[PDB]
Amino acid sequence: FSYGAVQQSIDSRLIVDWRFFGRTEPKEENKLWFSDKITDAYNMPQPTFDFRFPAGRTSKEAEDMMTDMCVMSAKIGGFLPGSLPQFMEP
Amino acid sequence: NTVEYQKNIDKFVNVIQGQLMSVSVPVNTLVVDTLSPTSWQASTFFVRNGSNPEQDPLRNLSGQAVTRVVGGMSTHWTCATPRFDREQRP
Amino acid sequence: MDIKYDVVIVGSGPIGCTYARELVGAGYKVAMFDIGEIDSGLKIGAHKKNTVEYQKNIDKFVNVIQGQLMSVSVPVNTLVVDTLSPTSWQASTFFVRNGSNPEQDPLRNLSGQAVTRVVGGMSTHWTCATPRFDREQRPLLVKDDADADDAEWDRLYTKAESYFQTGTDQFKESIRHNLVLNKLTEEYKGQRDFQQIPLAATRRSPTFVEWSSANTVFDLQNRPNTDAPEERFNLFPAVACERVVRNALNSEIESLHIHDLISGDRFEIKADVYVLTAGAVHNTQLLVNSGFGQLGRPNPANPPELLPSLGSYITEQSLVFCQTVMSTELIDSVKSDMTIRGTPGELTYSVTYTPGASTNKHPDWWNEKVKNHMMQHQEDPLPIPFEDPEPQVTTLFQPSHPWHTQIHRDAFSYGAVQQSIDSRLIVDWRFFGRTEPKEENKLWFSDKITDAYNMPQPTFDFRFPAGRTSKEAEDMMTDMCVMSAKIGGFLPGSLPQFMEPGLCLHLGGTHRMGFDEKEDNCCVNTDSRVFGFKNLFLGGCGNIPTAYGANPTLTAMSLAIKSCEYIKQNFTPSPF
Amino acid sequence: MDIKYDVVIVGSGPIGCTYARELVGAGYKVAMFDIGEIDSGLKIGAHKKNTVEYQKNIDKFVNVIQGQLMSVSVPVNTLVVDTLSPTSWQASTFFVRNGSNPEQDPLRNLSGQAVTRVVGGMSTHWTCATPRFDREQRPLLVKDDADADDAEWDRLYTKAESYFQTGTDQFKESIRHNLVLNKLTEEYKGQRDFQQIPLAATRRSPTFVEWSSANTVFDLQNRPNTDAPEERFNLFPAVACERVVRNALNSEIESLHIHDLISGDRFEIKADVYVLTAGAVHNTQLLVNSGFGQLGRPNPANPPELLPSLGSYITEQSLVFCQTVMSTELIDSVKSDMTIRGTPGELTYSVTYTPGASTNKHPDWWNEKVKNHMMQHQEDPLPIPFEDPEPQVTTLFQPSHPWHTQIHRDAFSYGAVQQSIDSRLIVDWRFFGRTEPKEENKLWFSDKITDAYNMPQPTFDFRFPAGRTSKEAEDMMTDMCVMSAKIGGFLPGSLPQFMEPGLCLHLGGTHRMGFDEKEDNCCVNTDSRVFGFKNLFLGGCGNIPTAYGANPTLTAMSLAIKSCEYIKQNFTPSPF
Ligand SMILES: *Cc1cc2c(cc1C)Nc1c([nH]c(=O)[nH]c1=O)N2C[C@H](O)[C@H](O)[C@H](O)COP(=O)(O)OP(=O)(O)OC[C@H]1O[C@@H](n2cnc3c(N)ncnc32)[C@H](O)[C@@H]1O
Ligand SMILES: *Cc1cc2c(cc1C)Nc1c([nH]c(=O)[nH]c1=O)N2C[C@H](O)[C@H](O)[C@H](O)COP(=O)(O)OP(=O)(O)OC[C@H]1O[C@@H](n2cnc3c(N)ncnc32)[C@H](O)[C@@H]1O
Ligand SMILES: *Cc1cc2c(cc1C)Nc1c([nH]c(=O)[nH]c1=O)N2C[C@H](O)[C@H](O)[C@H](O)COP(=O)(O)OP(=O)(O)OC[C@H]1O[C@@H](n2cnc3c(N)ncnc32)[C@H](O)[C@@H]1O
Ligand SMILES: OC[C@H]1O[C@@H](O)[C@H](O)[C@@H](F)[C@H]1O
Ligand SMILES: OC[C@H]1O[C@@H](O)[C@H](O)[C@@H](F)[C@H]1O
């Protein structure tokens, strides 16, 4: 699962992927709920999210995880252009 | 698990994307102001193309998707299967 | 700074410069104020393209234009950025950020509308295309007499043409220009007439063109000086003009309230005659902030005290655009008359033609230029010389093709300039439609939100009207596609398209002219005098009340010339 | 134009202006020639950013920068465009198009290298960062006596600083500036020191900064004038300088050949002293065009007669860049001292603080500014005032972090200017690494291909050296990652990245300084005089022989002040 148009200029043998995954505190306010009026493609109540990463530990760890990846990956190679370090869509 | 895909591993992203149906797409507010003045043109950002109007786009899991095929998401997953240590475990 | 002048002019654009040339010329003690600054070099308000370096690198001039176009009305942004770090400060709403206008509906805007705040205004970067309007496009200056009206316009346009140094032969000896010109002439024989775009410019050398500017019209130098020892002019740049002060009786302006941007001080400037030439948006802004029209979101329950049509009936032109890559056939035809002797780069290689040969398809000047290029650059696969001037072709507005056309090379490119394709093959196509004036089409100003100059924020409520305007726009696009195909196929990355509304910067009608305030729904009479007011005049494309396709600047200039004829008759210069 | 000068200076950039100020001051009859023109207003060679309009729309200045940055060497273009219409003229090869350099290897380029041809050079657009070099980055001017070397440098830099008006307090009252500075100080407490980036600048108002320029160094007005009746200066813009002419014995410059670009005339200018300050690329070009070094593709089996190190050992810094969006935490800290009751938008809402309370985390001036923003703009969700100046933070190069740092807001952005995140959150990060001088990294000039002004096309052969340079460069990327995280996460669209080689425009070494020509592999001695030549001097970043990360212009200027010292010791002003 690649996230952008795959580049062709750099030999793939050189390329390494880095994915770091953080844990999220379960919080009451983080909801998956369902519309009573809108429906999905199979006529079932349409799913709706109400979400944000909780401030505190979850948020702090996530930034630190980003920094960890930056620091670790430098040991192997510099960033590939077009695949710079980034948080992915929730 | 086809010879063709493990000989063309870059092409598999496409199969993934082919069966990840987004869970809740908020209403689209992209401005398109270069239509021909003869083409039918919206007065509002109305509910188009399966979008969820219940959905606050700033409190979403925009990347959340579902797969409807026998074998579900396991017909395309990466197969990483670590154990949780206590800290992560119920 | 003097306190009292005979005439004060707000803005140093070509149109302000028209009023200065006429009135400083006529002996009036004139002060000119511009919010922007002198930043074009020693020729004040002169064209920024008139440097050796820009004419050697014309691609780079897009950056100068971009750098002084400041969007008029930016809608609140609603792009979702959901990949911020969780530690980062993150919005709960799409709040008013970055000087966005929350009054602006993003689906009824002239998003491409921008303004320029520099001495010279937009004439320090404009394309300089100055055609006349035919009757169809043009406001009446005399009723019930078409011939008299045509004579009045032609007298005004000839003067306007000398001030700008308009001409139709500065590109006569470009191969590319004539390649395009001749082919379109032949393709539409008997059907349409093609020519050079009338350009406000004077060619100085085979590779240098002095583009005209506000500076050409009036040099903006303070007077008295040596060359004009008996005239009186003062330019005050970095001065934001905020208000004209109306008398209680709404019969006369009593002062211009200015803000000095350098010192910070505010002043009341007194003059016998006041002229607003701050552009079609800004004139309207200064009027509204002075009590004319209606401040705030339009409210038909509160009809305004003064100038009810102000900011209504606004016009801007549809613009469609592409670029083409010159056809193989046409490029072959550039060297039709040449006799070639073997292998390029080699010894055998010789290029020659027969001057005067009747069998030639092209003129001598053409063939000498191709011959010379193909002999000094044998590595090059094209017969076009490297510094061949660009095309500048048009078929002007007519009933059967009601849109202005430009087939040329514009310094304002709309994307990243591309370098895979040789620049000698590319020709831009810009067709401009005319827009019917509608009441509902509006430029208004917020009663709450202010701009970077702490003046009321401008807001558009515009749509290209259904009916003839829309149908003519779509028809206009078919015509560009059809005509352009006769020269070459579309350049990828510049495919045929409608440009953002307002991007073409031909906004008119925001303070529009007519004979009679009520019947003609208008703001100024044919002397450009604001109804009701003895000594208030407006200048600029704001005055034009019609549906027009051609570039409006020259027409606005003509109205300004007329306007100064009134002024000269009705006011007396102070003693020196 | 005159025939005989005491001194002639080629280039009117900040370094040429340094020579002009010292020498015009000491009574030398001086001419200065620049290939470029005056476009930046009545103050000649002034900073183009010193208009009220730009400082109110800072996002727009990038365009001015881009418009006057002409790439030095553009490799031939190999993009595949295969969706042309089949009637369109199409290439068979990737032939020399649009001014490209066919000598250039696209994989050993400093593709971001670019030059500017206007009066005042790059100083009409630069960021004005003027740090001093510490010892590790800086050439020696006295050997075996560190204290004498330090003392010489302190004196030179102190003078250079007064020429530029360099200061470190012009952003002392910025909330965002202090937010980041205080935070970084706290985090690294006792490992690294932070301060204001030293800036060539004077603040006029809470909302306007006069950025320094060539013009600040020397006003470029012709003398004698009212203010300098006994001085002699003449600036000849739009004059391309082509060659210095050597005597037979290679011991003197006999004249300078110029090309007046307007008239097209060519002259030989005679002077006592010849000063070359045309930029690190074009100085090299001029010298190479006058028989110095080796024209054409380097060929070691054809060793140069003069200056065998010219265009070798060149240095360009590595540049890494990101922007950050301020952390929720920092934003909440802005208002830590405030007491906020009720809800925003209501008559019951209040925001108050205790003046001069010992436990306030911020000073009164800060809290006053926050209070007023929050009370007067209750719709806005942020505590930072709208016109709060940008950050301007640095921790300077040290042996344990051998790179220069800028944590700031630069007018030269590198993408589309994003609109979705409030600019008040945004901080820029720019870390600059130093490059070892290596012989094999070369700037050279084609013996066949020429530039827009018909001089030999510059060509680069550059890679960042293996070992220390490459390792510091990666350790610098990571440092940027680690440090910036302390302030907020990365802004999507401005992810941490290495920028195009050359983009930072701190090219050095191309005509480098040393004590001894052979043993230090250099082109000029510590008086910046050319080895062998009594009366030819070179000024600029080209002189700098060491690996440095800090912005080099202050250092170049200092070397030029020492150069002037020698000139006043060895040549007499003509009588006035
Ligand atoms: C798509 C994907 C997901 C995984 C990874 C990568 C990619 C791109 N990588 C990955 C996975 N997880 C692992 O732990 N490690 C890896 O390295 N991915 C996630 C994993 O794929 C899922 O966690 C797992 O399948 C979930 O298993 P499940 O609980 O069995 O659910 P599935 O979604 O796989 O299959 C459910 C299934 O039910 C159907 N369906 C849905 N609704 C209905 C209704 N209303 N009626 C009847 N059936 C229903 C589906 O169509 C489907 O087959
Ligand atoms: C930018 C642009 C402009 C045009 C073309 C290309 C591009 C990229 N090309 C073109 C033009 N139109 C033609 O007829 N043909 C062409 O080939 N363009 C437009 C043309 O440039 C304008 O229509 C013309 O200048 C209008 O002149 P004007 O009515 O004098 O208005 P300007 O905007 O040039 O000058 C006004 C002026 O006033 C100032 N100002 C604004 N507000 C104030 C206040 N409040 N106080 C004091 N001064 C104020 C400005 O700073 C300015 O200079
Ligand atoms: C463009 C840029 C440059 C700087 C910064 C920002 C940006 C975007 N930031 C900055 C820089 N350095 C500082 O130390 N710190 C800052 O934060 N920038 C670099 C700085 O701008 C330059 O180092 C400085 O101007 C160089 O001074 P100079 O050595 O005097 O060179 P210039 O290029 O400025 O001026 C040379 C000059 O000569 C001309 N010319 C070139 N060729 C000829 C010939 N053949 N004949 C006659 N004249 C010639 C030019 O036209 C020019 O004016
Ligand atoms: O958008 C570019 C266009 O700008 C208009 O204002 C000009 O009148 C056209 F000639 C063309 O340059
Ligand atoms: O790339 C942008 C940078 O470029 C330089 O030449 C400057 O010295 C920096 F301050 C910074 O503006």
Residue numbers in the entry:
A (entry chain C): 454 to 543
B (entry chain C): 92 to 181
C (entry chain B), D (entry chain A): 43 to 618
Q: How does the study describe this entry?
A:
Based on the overall more similar kinetics with Glc and Gal, we expected the V546C mutant to behave structurally more similar to H167A (and the wild type) than does the H450G variant. Thus, the binding of Gal is identical to that of Glc binding for productive oxidation at C2. For all GAL mutants investigated here, the axial O4 group in 3FGal can in fact be accommodated in the productive 2-oxidation binding mode without introducing a smaller side chain at position 169. Not only is the axial O4 group spatially accommodated in the GAL mutants, but also receiving stabilizing hydrogen bonds from Asp452 and Thr169. In the case of the GAL mutants, subtle backbone changes in the active site provide conformational freedom of the active site to accommodate the axial O4 hydroxyl group without interfering with the function of Thr169. The steric hindrance is effectively relieved by subtle relaxation at key backbone positions in the active site, either 546 or 450, or both, which allows for more favorable binding modes of Gal. Stabilizing interactions are offered by Asp452 Oδ2 and Thr169 Oγ1 to the axial C4 hydroxyl group in Gal, which is expected to facilitate binding of Gal oriented for productive 2-oxidation, presumably also to promote conversion to the 2-keto galactose product. For the V546C variant, a selectivity ratio of 210 shows that the relative efficiency is even less favorable than for the wild type.
